[PDB]
Design an enzyme around this catalytic site. Structure first.
Site, PDB file in Angstrom:
ATOM      1  N   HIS A 296      -0.430   3.415   9.865  1.00 48.73           N
ATOM      2  CA  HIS A 296      -1.632   2.786   9.230  1.00 48.73           C
ATOM      3  C   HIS A 296      -1.206   1.892   8.073  1.00 48.73           C
ATOM      4  O   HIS A 296      -1.874   0.883   7.815  1.00 48.73           O
ATOM      5  CB  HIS A 296      -2.597   3.858   8.687  1.00 48.73           C
TER       6      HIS A 296
ATOM      7  N   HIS B  38       0.959   2.510  -1.598  1.00 43.52           N
ATOM      8  CA  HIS B  38       0.914   1.761  -0.339  1.00 43.52           C
ATOM      9  C   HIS B  38       0.069   0.537  -0.540  1.00 43.52           C
ATOM     10  O   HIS B  38      -0.504   0.339  -1.613  1.00 43.52           O
ATOM     11  CB  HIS B  38       0.344   2.615   0.784  1.00 43.52           C
TER      12      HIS B  38
ATOM     13  N   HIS C  67      -2.659  -2.454   1.542  1.00 45.12           N
ATOM     14  CA  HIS C  67      -3.511  -2.960   2.638  1.00 45.12           C
ATOM     15  C   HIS C  67      -3.382  -4.474   2.657  1.00 45.12           C
ATOM     16  O   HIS C  67      -3.355  -5.060   1.549  1.00 45.12           O
ATOM     17  CB  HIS C  67      -4.975  -2.530   2.476  1.00 45.12           C
TER      18      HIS C  67
ATOM     19  N   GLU D 201      -9.216  -4.569   0.121  1.00 48.31           N
ATOM     20  CA  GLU D 201     -10.316  -3.618   0.444  1.00 48.31           C
ATOM     21  C   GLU D 201     -11.443  -3.799  -0.551  1.00 48.31           C
ATOM     22  O   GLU D 201     -12.533  -4.173  -0.172  1.00 48.31           O
ATOM     23  CB  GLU D 201      -9.773  -2.193   0.371  1.00 48.31           C
TER      24      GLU D 201
ATOM     25  N   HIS E 156      -2.361   0.239  -3.758  1.00 49.21           N
ATOM     26  CA  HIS E 156      -2.974   1.508  -4.166  1.00 49.21           C
ATOM     27  C   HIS E 156      -1.869   2.448  -4.650  1.00 49.21           C
ATOM     28  O   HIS E 156      -1.035   2.887  -3.857  1.00 49.21           O
ATOM     29  CB  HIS E 156      -3.725   2.167  -3.000  1.00 49.21           C
TER      30      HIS E 156
ATOM     31  N   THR F 121     -10.149   5.399   1.368  1.00 48.52           N
ATOM     32  CA  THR F 121     -10.612   4.256   2.189  1.00 48.52           C
ATOM     33  C   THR F 121     -10.155   4.428   3.625  1.00 48.52           C
ATOM     34  O   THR F 121     -10.435   3.501   4.392  1.00 48.52           O
ATOM     35  CB  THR F 121     -10.140   2.925   1.589  1.00 48.52           C
TER      36      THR F 121
HETATM   37  N1  LIG Z   1      -9.235  21.747   3.619  1.00 58.15           N
HETATM   38  C1  LIG Z   1     -10.396  21.055   3.489  1.00 58.15           C
HETATM   39  C2  LIG Z   1     -11.583  21.797   3.344  1.00 58.15           C
HETATM   40  C3  LIG Z   1     -12.811  21.160   3.202  1.00 58.15           C
HETATM   41  C4  LIG Z   1     -12.856  19.764   3.206  1.00 58.15           C
HETATM   42  C5  LIG Z   1     -11.694  18.977   3.331  1.00 58.15           C
HETATM   43  C6  LIG Z   1     -10.407  19.547   3.466  1.00 58.15           C
HETATM   44  N2  LIG Z   1      -9.262  18.799   3.750  1.00 58.15           N
HETATM   45  C7  LIG Z   1      -9.287  17.645   4.491  1.00 58.15           C
HETATM   46  O1  LIG Z   1     -10.331  17.130   4.881  1.00 58.15           O
HETATM   47  C8  LIG Z   1      -8.046  16.825   4.872  1.00 58.15           C
HETATM   48  C9  LIG Z   1      -7.080  16.522   3.902  1.00 58.15           C
HETATM   49  C10 LIG Z   1      -5.962  15.745   4.198  1.00 58.15           C
HETATM   50  C11 LIG Z   1      -5.793  15.223   5.486  1.00 58.15           C
HETATM   51  N3  LIG Z   1      -4.714  14.434   5.820  1.00 58.15           N
HETATM   52  C12 LIG Z   1      -3.598  14.014   4.952  1.00 58.15           C
HETATM   53  C13 LIG Z   1      -3.911  13.109   3.766  1.00 58.15           C
HETATM   54  O2  LIG Z   1      -3.372  13.382   2.722  1.00 58.15           O
HETATM   55  N4  LIG Z   1      -4.762  12.086   3.888  1.00 58.15           N
HETATM   56  C14 LIG Z   1      -5.196  11.236   2.778  1.00 58.15           C
HETATM   57  C15 LIG Z   1      -4.193  10.188   2.416  1.00 58.15           C
HETATM   58  C16 LIG Z   1      -4.837   8.960   1.744  1.00 58.15           C
HETATM   59  C17 LIG Z   1      -4.436   8.631   0.448  1.00 58.15           C
HETATM   60  C18 LIG Z   1      -4.896   7.492  -0.206  1.00 58.15           C
HETATM   61  C19 LIG Z   1      -5.871   6.626   0.422  1.00 58.15           C
HETATM   62  S1  LIG Z   1      -6.497   5.245  -0.327  1.00 58.15           S
HETATM   63  N5  LIG Z   1      -6.355   4.016   0.678  1.00 58.15           N
HETATM   64  O3  LIG Z   1      -7.872   5.563  -0.589  1.00 58.15           O
HETATM   65  O4  LIG Z   1      -5.655   5.018  -1.504  1.00 58.15           O
HETATM   66  C20 LIG Z   1      -6.225   7.032   1.725  1.00 58.15           C
HETATM   67  C21 LIG Z   1      -5.725   8.141   2.388  1.00 58.15           C
HETATM   68  C22 LIG Z   1      -6.772  15.500   6.481  1.00 58.15           C
HETATM   69  C23 LIG Z   1      -7.890  16.286   6.171  1.00 58.15           C
HETATM   70 ZN   LIG Z   2      -5.153   2.569   0.231  1.00 56.80          ZN
END
Ligand SMILES: Nc1ccccc1NC(=O)c1ccc(NCC(=O)NCCc2ccc(S(N)(=O)=O)cc2)cc1
Ligand SMILES: [Zn+2]
Length: 258
Positions: free
Chosen positions: A62, A92, A94, A104, A117, A196
């Site tokens: 991504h 990272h 975009h 974004e 970001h 995002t």
């Molecule tokens: N455990 C739990 C319980 C209730 C609600 C939510 C959660 N946890 C989650 O939903 C969950 C947490 C992490 C997950 N994947 C790995 C992860 O770290 N993803 C986020 C990374 C990210 C970081 C930065 C950005 S940005 N573009 O906004 O800067 C976007 C995305 C996938 C799902």
């Molecule tokens: Zn980002």
């Protein structure tokens, strides 16, 4: 059939797996500079990156992430709208297929060529996975990129990209100093929002710097030679990995400056 940025799995589809896509505090947003209110009670940002320890660079399919050692208070963001201490975990970008798009956030509907970001998590929650479950878990420092003069402090990132062309590739990436990516001014806008990308969790205090950094045409062209695909899969260039502006809803954007 996983999420991405294509016609069939792009941002207009994400709500089917991630219903919070249509939530009350989604990011990014358009920053209407005339409606943002100056908040004289906002503090200067404190960006303390002198002890940052970069470790690795990863193509995750991504974007690419430059990852840091966040097992101690080494590179932290404090002050501004924040309570407490937020640790740098990764940065990272975009970016677009063309210099006219890629950011974004937008500013009075203006799109920049790219957006950096710097992702930080609130140390009171102990690690990143816990922090993303909290409404004040993350602070993301957003910096716009415009095409013009090269950013010398970016070139070490640009030059390693050929070693992480495809999804799942990583490379050692030590001793990278993220201070070389900052503009002169730390004047910012701030609002409560979200990740995002999926899972689009509403856990982010956004801090978006007013002053863009300049990168060269050759620097951003090298971003556009990355691949969304894995090695030995059909080549799909990693371009237009941005979510468009989302409804502001019941939010005020605050400005640190007049
Ligand atoms: N455990 C739990 C319980 C209730 C609600 C939510 C959660 N946890 C989650 O939903 C969950 C947490 C992490 C997950 N994947 C790995 C992860 O770290 N993803 C986020 C990374 C990210 C970081 C930065 C950005 S940005 N573009 O906004 O800067 C976007 C995305 C996938 C799902
Ligand atoms: Zn980002």
């Amino acid at each position: 059939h996983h999420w991405g940025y294509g016609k069939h799995n792009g941002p207009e589809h994400w709500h089917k797996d991630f219903p919070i896509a249509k939530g009350e505090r989604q990011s990014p947003v358009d920053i209407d500079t005339h409606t943002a209110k100056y908040d004289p009670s906002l503090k200067p940002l404190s960006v303390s990156y002198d002890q940052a320890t970069s470790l690795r660079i990863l193509n995750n399919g991504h974007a690419f992430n430059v990852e840091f050692d966040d097992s101690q208070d080494k590179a932290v963001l404090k002050g501004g709208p924040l309570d407490g201490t937020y640790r740098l975990i990764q940065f990272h970008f975009h970016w677009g297929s063309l210099d006219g798009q890629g950011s974004e956030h937008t500013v009075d509907k203006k799109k920049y060529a790219a957006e950096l970001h710097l992702v930080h998590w609130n140390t009171k929650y102990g690690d990143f996975g816990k922090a993303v479950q909290q409404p004040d878990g993350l602070a993301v420092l957003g910096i716009f990129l415009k095409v013009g003069s090269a950013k010398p402090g970016l070139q070490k990132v640009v030059d390693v990209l050929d070693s992480i062309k495809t999804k799942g590739k990583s490379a050692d990436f030590t001793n990278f100093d993220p201070r070389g990516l900052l503009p002169e001014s730390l004047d910012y806008w701030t609002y409560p929002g979200s990740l995002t990308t999926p899972p689009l969790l509403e856990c982010v205090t956004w801090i978006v710097l007013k002053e863009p950094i300049s990168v060269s045409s050759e620097q951003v062209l090298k971003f556009r030679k990355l691949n969304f695909n894995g090695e030995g899969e059909p080549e799909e260039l990693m371009v237009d990995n941005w979510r468009p502006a989302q409804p502001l809803k019941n939010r005020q954007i605050k400005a640190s400056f007049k």
